[PDB]
Design a protein around this ligand. Structure first.
Ligand SMILES: Nc1nc2c(ncn2[C@@H]2O[C@H](COP(=O)(O)OP(=O)(O)OP(=O)(O)O)[C@@H](O)[C@H]2O)c(=O)[nH]1
Ligand SMILES: [Mg+2]
Lengths: 165, 151, 309
């Protein structure tokens, strides 16, 4: 299957998105001390998305999951205005790794349900997705509770990853 | 309780090494070597209840051992354990190995050690005796074997 | 494409399993260091693959090498992957390796948290049991703090198989995280009442260890230790309780004063010589502490020496 590493800040929606994608169910979540791994097949293409915890204390542990990954997913809490910076420094440091030069980045702007969630364009501007070089990227405003935008993001991820029908 | 269980031949070569109390890898190897000299040099007519080694944390502990042919079985236990009870447990552990391997032999220690460990895990958990009922321990071993075979 | 996959399978057929490792070592003893270091490098390459069955095999080989004294800590993350495998047939391998390879000073203590809990929450008693025994040799105070929240629940698991294992690991939890021991102490007292004697026995082993380490918690339990001995028919268990009694009498002679009767009766009923010795040795110590002010201990001694003879 396609090896995808999905990261983000704590409480962003990584676990919720992964479990909704596999089971179609919004499950109650507790902070991920370790990690989660689930293999999801979308449009006949199987994606093994590795859910690594988003807590800062375990953010240094992100190094162990970089190898052989074919895609990066960054669950963006558009409601968390206070941590948009911390998100952008984390993203820039992650892209500084040479191990992720040929991987693909799909940006999930999560938590669109709250009234104070910023639009996806502002998410791109804050994350500097427009300034990336040699990086095939896309952004999709997503909502973990409702699931809107998840299948479009999966479609795009397959499209860049797959090579034929 | 049980600090470590070692199985090794008459040349000091390992057949099983499972520790319960934390030791460095080098310490572990050295404990084995110490134990080897402490056990393999004992005559067949020597009491199976020996003093503990020093690398394990102190001689207060005991080395309960049993051997045959070229194989030595040593149970490193602490000072509060029943040397006699242990010896009984050692023998029935062996009986379990026979029940599960249709007569365990050196080649099972050599090529099936993973299952020996599985069995051992059912016998002892974390240095504490997990099971004393020999038919039940076989039952659970086979229950796992069936699970594996099933899927 | 398809033939490249076939090539992988062909190459796989010439790859060494645990037994092949062993056989090669036996055939290359003179070049053992060369052989093994070569195999280790091959393992390093194998662990960079995406085939978990192969990687689990590589871990099996490493586990063997762990027995041989080789440092395989660099593969600990890869071992974790094996533990995170969808099949317990490989998770178990990882847990086996981890029980002898993982250390509290390594970063696996954070990395494994979710997978461990997932296996503990799994309905499969064998997956959970495997995880628990992995933890029995590899667990930290931090893992103890957070995993115990689930393990205490596991001590009420439908199957005694697990309740038993869960009880023994809680001992280690207490050793590393006594803060859980406090609320879990009465729980253990309740686990001593478990209808299934196998679980109950484990509970006895734990509480006896707790009393040994800290006698302040045995006093009010002395009546209970008495009942445990009285009701137990498991010689190993009796040994534990009786030895504990040997360790309790110095602190409370009047306990011994009452115990000496059923202990005498026990000795009369004892058929196992291994038990007999333990019984006799124990009551001798008891009689010594009781000899002051009790001029009938010599009759008890008379019995003791009849048995010693
Ligand atoms: N309002 C709203 N809440 C969401 C959405 N998606 C997830 N959440 C909530 O956000 C909280 C955190 O979600 P998690 O999935 O646990 O976050 P995480 O990224 O896995 O956090 P870590 O495990 O620490 O890395 C939970 O209470 C979720 O229910 C969303 O789209 N909208
Ligand atoms: Mg999470």
């Amino acid at each position: 299957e396609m090896r995808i590493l999905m990261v983000g800040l704590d409480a962003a929606g990584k676990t919720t998105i992964l479990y909704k994608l596999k089971l179609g169910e919004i499950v109650t979540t507790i902070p991920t001390i370790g990690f989660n791994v689930e293999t999801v097949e979308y449009k006949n293409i199987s994606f093994t998305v590795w859910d690594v915890g988003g807590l800062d204390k375990i953010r240094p542990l992100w190094r162990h999951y970089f190898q052989n990954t074919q895609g990066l997913i960054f669950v963006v809490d558009s409601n968390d205005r206070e941590r948009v910076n911390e998100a952008r420094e984390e993203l820039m440091r992650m892209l500084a790794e040479d191990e992720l030069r040929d991987a693909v980045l799909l940006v999930f702007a999560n938590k669109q349900d709250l009234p104070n969630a910023m639009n996806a364009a502002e998410i791109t501007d804050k994350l500097g997705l427009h300034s990336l070089r040699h990086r095939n990227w896309y952004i999709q405003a997503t909502c973990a509770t409702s699931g809107d935008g998840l299948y479009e993001g999966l479609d795009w991820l397959s499209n860049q990853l797959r090579n034929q029908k | 309780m049980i600090k470590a269980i070692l199985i090794f031949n008459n040349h000091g070569k390992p057949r099983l090494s499972k520790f319960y109390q934390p030791y460095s890898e080098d310490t572990q190897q050295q404990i084995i070597r110490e134990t080897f000299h402490l056990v393999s040099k004992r005559d067949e007519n020597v009491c199976n209840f020996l003093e503990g080694g020093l690398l394990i944390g102190g001689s207060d502990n005991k080395l309960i051992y049993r051997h045959y042919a070229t194989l030595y079985f040593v149970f490193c236990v602490d000072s509060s354990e029943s040397e006699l009870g242990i010896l009984d447990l050692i023998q029935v552990f062996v009986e379990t190995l026979d029940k599960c391997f249709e007569n365990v032999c050196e080649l099972d220690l050599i090529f099936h050690v993973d299952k020996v460990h599985n069995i051992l895990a059912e016998m002892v958990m974390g240095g504490m005796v997990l099971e004393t009922n020999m038919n039940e321990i076989v039952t659970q071993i086979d229950a796992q074997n069936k699970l594996e075979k099933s899927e | 494409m398809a033939l490249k996959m076939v090539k992988g399978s062909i190459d796989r057929m010439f790859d060494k399993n645990l037994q092949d490792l062993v056989r090669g070592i036996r055939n290359h003893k003179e070049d053992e260091a060369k052989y093994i270091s070569q195999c280790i490098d091959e393992i390093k390459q194998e662990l960079k693959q995406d085939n978990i069955a192969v990687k689990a095999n590589a871990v099996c080989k490493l586990t063997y090498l762990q027995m041989l004294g080789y440092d395989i800590s660099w593969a600990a993350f890869n071992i974790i992957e094996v533990m995170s495998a969808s099949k317990f047939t490989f998770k178990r391998i990882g847990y086996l390796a981890a029980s002898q390879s993982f250390h509290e000073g390594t970063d696996v203590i954070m990395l494994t948290t979710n997978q461990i809990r997932k296996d503990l929450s799994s309905p499969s008693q064998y997956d959970t049991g495997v995880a628990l025994t992995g933890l029995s040799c590899f667990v930290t105070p931090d893992l103890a703090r957070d995993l115990a929240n689930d393990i205490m629940t596991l001590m009420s698991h439908t199957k005694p198989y697990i309740r038993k294992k869960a009880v023994l690991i809680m001992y280690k939890v207490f050793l590393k995280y006594p803060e859980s021991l406090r609320p879990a102490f009465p729980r253990l007292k309740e686990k001593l009442e478990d209808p299934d004697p196998g679980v109950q026995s484990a509970a006895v082993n734990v509480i006896c260890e707790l009393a040994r380490r800290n006698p302040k918690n045995y006093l009010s339990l002395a009546p209970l230790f008495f009942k445990l001995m009285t009701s137990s028919t498991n010689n190993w268990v009796l040994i534990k309780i009786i030895k504990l009694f040997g360790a309790l009498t110095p602190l409370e002679p009047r306990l011994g004063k009452k115990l000496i009767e059923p202990l005498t009766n026990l000795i009369h009923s004892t058929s196992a010589m291994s038990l007999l010795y333990e019984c006799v040795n124990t009551v001798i110590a008891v009689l010594i502490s009781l000899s002051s002010g009790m001029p009938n201990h010599s009759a008890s001694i008379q019995l003791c020496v009849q048995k010693l003879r």
